[PDB]
Amino acid sequence: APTATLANGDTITGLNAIINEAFLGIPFAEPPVGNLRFKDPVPYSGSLDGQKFTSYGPSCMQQNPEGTYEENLPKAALDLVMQSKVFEAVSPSSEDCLTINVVRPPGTKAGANLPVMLWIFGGGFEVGGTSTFPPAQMITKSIAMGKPIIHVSVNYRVSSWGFLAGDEIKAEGSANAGLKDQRLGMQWVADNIAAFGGDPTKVTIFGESAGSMSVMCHILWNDGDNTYKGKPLFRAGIMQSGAMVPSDAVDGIYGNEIFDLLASNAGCGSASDKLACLRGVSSDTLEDATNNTPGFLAYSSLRLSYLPRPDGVNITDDMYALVREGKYANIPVIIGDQNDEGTFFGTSSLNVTTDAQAREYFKQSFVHASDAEIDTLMTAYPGDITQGSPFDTGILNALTPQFKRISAVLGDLGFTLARRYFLNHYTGGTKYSFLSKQLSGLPVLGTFHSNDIVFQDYLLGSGSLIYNNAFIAFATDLDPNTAGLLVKWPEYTSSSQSGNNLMMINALGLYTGKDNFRTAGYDALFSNPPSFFV
Ligand SMILES: *[C@@H]1O[C@H](CO)[C@@H](O[C@@H]2O[C@H](CO)[C@@H](O)[C@H](O)[C@H]2NC(C)=O)[C@H](O)[C@H]1NC(C)=O
Ligand SMILES: *[P@@](=O)(CCCCCC)O[C@H]1C[C@@H](C)CC[C@@H]1C(C)C
Ligand SMILES: *[C@@H]1O[C@H](CO)[C@@H](O)[C@H](O)[C@H]1NC(C)=O
Ligand SMILES: [Ca+2]
Ligand SMILES: [Ca+2]
């Protein structure tokens, strides 16, 4: 029933889900298979005329989050699960996965010109798909608010398939393939969304975790030039847990070690041209070799095997330097965090129980950090269990004498304080920041990383006021205050500003606070950002 005529004259049919109309699985690029592997996406050249788009297509190949060159139970078990016919059935994945999904309010028509919210999923740049982030909660609330929006989601390559680095990839001009996938989808939205009733000039990009860092990367792309055919690709961005990526260049030391490890694993350790050898191995072999490099939940943790890295061409430099140097798109932004962002990552090093061990783990993790810096870091984040994350839980959650400490460091460097650094240097437009404490008291994890996904897509809670309502008003009017919330969200100018600069959330509701916590950790970490790059 639902129909749309694209920018090339093709008329496609979607699905009527009663509460919304959706067009799922629209191919936006030519399948990145064979010799197209690891390469930039090629625009989809073909005809969709007469086709129905009523189901999500498969996700891109996934990597075992517990993957590693080592052997163990978590790895073995997840592999058992991931290769199961039942898993392969409920959650299909493939190298041919570059599709886009359009979901809208019922009765929407071409010319409606509704604001567009483009979702970029998070999955540690190693797993993930669009199908697991239902847009219905957001769409329904938008209608109820009288501020209807259209939800767009894009599949992008993850893990080795989307983020392979090293000397060969650099020389070839193929770095950050997964981000390029996201970029093409944006371009597809500019060219076709009007046919669906969206306004290509009212696009707000948003993601969580890896998707959020992806949003920051888009703000930094091509030194801030976000135009396509003369017009900006998006008027705003919402970053849920994640800002700049703390990483070395594509041809840096870890980018290359990982490339070589994967090559040995696929049986290309002897190839004169390892990259050409990698294009020739079957999907099985490649999936296997990849599952034998660390996953984001493995001991390596934050020191990820695959993630966005500066390439000197599309992301021209260290991401912290670009932000300092003003090389970003000038747009209004919302960027927030959950109180306890690092408790998940802290679960990866529960065999680290003494301070001597904590010092070596950090040393292993941050190869560019001097002993002085490691020592400053370990003073800024003391062993005192009352000081760590879950924050403000006293002597509880002492899985080990280092869990709370390690959880505090990782969540701050990767998200929470990284956000403050951005906020303190960004002048491209109005800023709004939030800190959630909605799940205070939840054992072991606290107000954990990802909980916002629940309250944005699955259940309603005090947080939904922000994750849905406030986010909908911002995409529509560029001011979250138009949502008519009882607590006015203050503009964030600086972390040193007087007065509350943070919207906050607790189980009962909203309130405002200050972004002045853990200042010693901020300076321990960000006085010279490159000391803690991976
Ligand atoms: C905690 O566990 C990790 C993971 O096994 C240990 O690190 C591995 O140790 C083996 C044996 O020495 C090495 O071959 C691997 O290279 C290490 N893995 C990684 C990912 O680095 C680590 O030594 C243990 N830590 C403590 C404090 O016991
Ligand atoms: P994000 O996608 C992790 C990004 C790590 C960046 C380091 C440079 O992680 C969460 C994604 C979410 C959708 C589910 C759970 C994930 C972890 C917090 C476990
Ligand atoms: C990457 O950079 C080059 C050089 O500026 C540019 O021509 C190319 O179009 C960029 N890629 C993307 C996806 O924007
Ligand atoms: Ca090499
Ligand atoms: Ca500038």
Q: Which H/E stretch holds residue 3?
A: strand 3-5
Query: Two tokens at 527?
Result: 């006085």
Task: Give the C-alpha distances (Å, rounded to integers) separating 49 from 153, 184, 195, 424.
Answer: 21, 21, 14, 49
* Amino acid identity, position 322: L
Residues 6+ apart with CB under 8 A from 359: 374, 378
* Amino acid identity, position 259: F
Q: What are the DSSP calls for 271-338, one per residue?
A: -SSHHHHHHHS-HHHHHHHHTTS--TTSTTTTS-SS-----SSSS-S-HHHHHHTT-S----EEEEEE
Query: Are 161 and 150 within 8 A, CB to CB?
Result: no
- Residue 207's beta-bridge partner residues? 120, 239
Query: Two tokens at 323?
Result: 């932000």
Best CA proximity match to 54, nearest among 17, 5, 89, 85? 17
Query: Two tokens at 481?
Result: 């205050």
Q: What are the DSSP calls for 174-241, one per residue?
A: -TTHHHHHHHHHHHHHHHHGGGGTEEEEEEEEEEETHHHHHHHHHHHGGGG--EETTEES-SEEEEES
Q: Ligand 4 center to residue 274 CA distance, Å?
A: 9
CA 291 from centre of chain: 21
Say if ligand 2 is within 6 A of residue 209 CB: yes
SS3 state of residue 11:
strand
Q: Which atom of ligand 1 is nearest to the CA of 364?
A: 21
Pocket test for ligand 2, best of 449, 452, 525 (most atoms within 8 A of CB): 449
Query: Are 120 and 209 within 8 A, CB to CB?
Result: no
Query: Are 149 and 139 within 8 A, CB to CB?
Result: yes
Query: Are 473 and 406 within 8 A, CB to CB?
Result: no
Alpha-carbon distance of 429 to 110, in angstroms, equals 31
Q: Is 368 a catalytic residue?
A: no
Determine phi and psi for 464, rounding to 5 degrees: -60, -25
Q: At what angle do helices 371-380 and 355-365 cross, to 10 degrees?
A: 120
Alpha-carbon distance of 461 to 465, in angstroms, equals 7
- Residue 231's beta-bridge partner residues? 228
* Amino acid identity, position 37: R
The bridge status of strand 333-338 relative to strand 431-436 is: parallel
- Residue 24's beta-bridge partner residues? 54
Query: Two tokens at 397?
Result: 């959650």
Q: What is the dihedral of CA 204, 208, 214, 220, to 10 degrees?
A: 60
* Amino acid identity, position 293: T
Task: Give the C-alpha distances (Å, rounded to integers) separating 37 from 128, 281, 292.
Answer: 19, 11, 19
Query: Two tokens at 346?
Result: 């802290």
Query: Are 348 and 446 within 8 A, CB to CB?
Result: no
Q: What angle do CA 206, 207, 213 make, to 5 degrees?
A: 110
Task: Give the C-alpha distances (Å, rounded to integers) separating 236 from 202, 239, 240.
Answer: 8, 10, 13
Query: Are 411 and 417 within 8 A, CB to CB?
Result: no
Residues in the chain: 534
The bridge status of strand 114-120 relative to strand 150-154 is: parallel
Q: Which ligand is nearest to the CA of 124?
A: 2
Q: What are the DSSP calls for 415-442, one per residue?
A: IIHHHHHHHHH--SS-EEEEEE-TTTT-
Q: Which ligand is nearest to the CA of 175?
A: 3
Q: Which atom of ligand 2 is nearest to the CA of 453?
A: 13
Pocket test for ligand 3, best of 222, 315, 317 (most atoms within 8 A of CB): 222
Q: Is residue 460 packed enough to be buried (19+ CB in 10 Å), middle (13-18) or exposed (0-12)?
A: middle
**Residue corresponding to tokens 């998200």:** 415
Q: Please compute, for residue 283, the number of CA atoms within 13 A of its CA located in the half-sphere on the CB side.
A: 11
* Radius of gyration in angstroms for the set of CA atoms belonging to the chain, rounded to a whole number: 22
**Residue corresponding to tokens 């509460």:** 19
Whether the bond into 65 is cis, omega within 30 of 0: no
Residues 6+ apart with CB under 8 A from 83: none
Q: Is residue 35 packed enough to be buried (19+ CB in 10 Å), middle (13-18) or exposed (0-12)?
A: exposed
Number of neighbours of residue 274 by Cβ within 10 angstroms: 19
Query: Two tokens at 396?
Result: 């509880």
Q: What are the DSSP calls for 16-78, one per residue?
A: E-SS-EEEEEEE-B----GGGTTSPPPBP-S--TT-B-BS--PBPP---TT--SS--HHHHHH
What one-character DSSP code corresponds to residue 12?
E
Pocket test for ligand 1, best of 351, 403, 406 (most atoms within 8 A of CB): 351
State in Å, rounded, how far the first CA of the chain is from the last one: 50
Say if ligand 3 is within 6 A of residue 218 CB: no
**Residue corresponding to tokens 């509704």:** 114
Domains (range + CATH), the chain: 1-534 (3.40.50.1820)
Catalytic residue, from 174, 209, 348, 365: name it: 209
Alpha-carbon distance of 14 to 111, in angstroms, equals 18
Say if ligand 2 is within 6 A of residue 329 CB: no
Task: Give the C-alpha distances (Å, rounded to integers) separating 362 from 200, 257, 372, 398.
Answer: 45, 19, 12, 19
SS3 state of residue 512:
strand
**Residue corresponding to tokens 């707000």:** 204
Per-residue b/e over 352-378, b at no fewer than 16 CB within 10 Å?
beeeeebbebbeebbeebeeebbebbb
Determine phi and psi for 117, rounding to 5 degrees: -115, 110
Q: Is 151 a catalytic residue?
A: no
Alpha-carbon distance of 79 to 64, in angstroms, equals 7
Query: Two tokens at 123?
Result: 């999955």
SS3 state of residue 526:
helix
Q: Is residue 229 packed enough to be buried (19+ CB in 10 Å), middle (13-18) or exposed (0-12)?
A: exposed
Q: Ligand 5 center to residue 325 CA distance, Å?
A: 7
Best CA proximity match to 352, nearest among 390, 383, 316? 383
Query: Two tokens at 1?
Result: 């029933």
Q: Residues 58, 450, 137, 473: is their CA dihedral positive or negative?
A: negative
Q: Ligand 4 center to residue 408 CA distance, Å?
A: 34
Q: At what angle do helices 283-290 and 253-266 cross, to 10 degrees?
A: 130
Alpha-carbon distance of 415 to 421, in angstroms, equals 10
Say if ligand 2 is within 6 A of residue 450 CB: yes
SS3 state of residue 450:
coil
Q: At what angle do helices 177-192 and 210-220 cross, to 10 degrees?
A: 70
What one-character DSSP code corresponds to residue 469?
I
Whether the bond into 308 is cis, omega within 30 of 0: no
Q: Which ligand is nearest to the CA of 316?
A: 3
Say if ligand 1 is within 6 A of residue 362 CB: no
Residues 6+ apart with CB under 8 A from 516: 495
Residues 6+ apart with CB under 8 A from 214: 120, 122, 179, 182, 207, 308
Alpha-carbon distance of 426 to 431, in angstroms, equals 8
**Residue corresponding to tokens 């000039």:** 201
Query: Two tokens at 219?
Result: 């703000």
Query: Are 447 and 347 within 8 A, CB to CB?
Result: no
SS3 state of residue 519:
helix
Q: Is 218 a catalytic residue?
A: no
- Mapping DSSP onto H, E and C, the string for 314-326 reads CCCCCHHHHHHCC
Query: Two tokens at 177?
Result: 């393939």
Q: What angle do CA 122, 124, 125 make, to 5 degrees?
A: 85
Task: Give the C-alpha distances (Å, rounded to integers) separating 306 from 99, 287, 419.
Answer: 22, 14, 21
